[model samples]
Target chain A: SKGDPGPPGDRGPKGPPGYKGPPGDKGFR
Target chain B: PDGDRGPRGPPGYPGDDGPEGDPGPPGDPG
Candidate 1:
């Protein structure tokens, strides 16, 4: 039978960074 | 018989981070 999966591959490559967040509302005087 | 499938190799290091995203618009004036 096919061998059990090799030890899972090394921890996979790091994931990409997240997208930028939205701007905040203007402050009052 | 072959030994049980050999132990797996260690996992690889994490990959590089993704590119930066666009910035959001400015907020209204105070």
Candidate 2:
């Protein structure tokens, strides 16, 4: 009693690209 | 005395995606 939910699994793997923020402080002349 | 342009640094964190894997059940009814 379970053969209609086996066609939708395998689509998770894409997360790793976020870390670059540090350069703001140079205004005084 | 001159200063104008300094205050922009804070943004990094975008990575998350993993959820989809569950299917296997159908073979016993005869």
Interface DockQ per candidate: 0.26, 0.04
Per-residue lDDT tens digits of candidate 1, residues A1-29?
54553333345455556455455454444
Candidate 1 lDDT tens digits, B1-30: 333544555555554554554454465665
Candidate 1 stretches greater than 4 Å from native = A1-29, B27-30
lDDT measured at residue B27 in model 1 versus the true structure, 0 to 100: 55
**For residues B1-30, could you state the per-residue lDDT of candidate 2 as single tens digits?**
343444544444458544433443444554
TM-score of chain A of each: 0.40, 0.25
| Best-fitting candidate, scored by DockQ | 1
> How do the predictions measure up, each by TM-score?
0.38, 0.24
Position A15, candidate 2: lDDT:
52
Runs with alpha carbons beyond 4 Å of true place in candidate 2: A1-6, A27-29, B1-30
Taking the tens digit of each residue's C-alpha lDDT, what string does model 2 give over A1-29? 33332233344555574454444444434
In the predicted model 2, the residue pairs found to clash are none
Docking class for candidate 1? acceptable
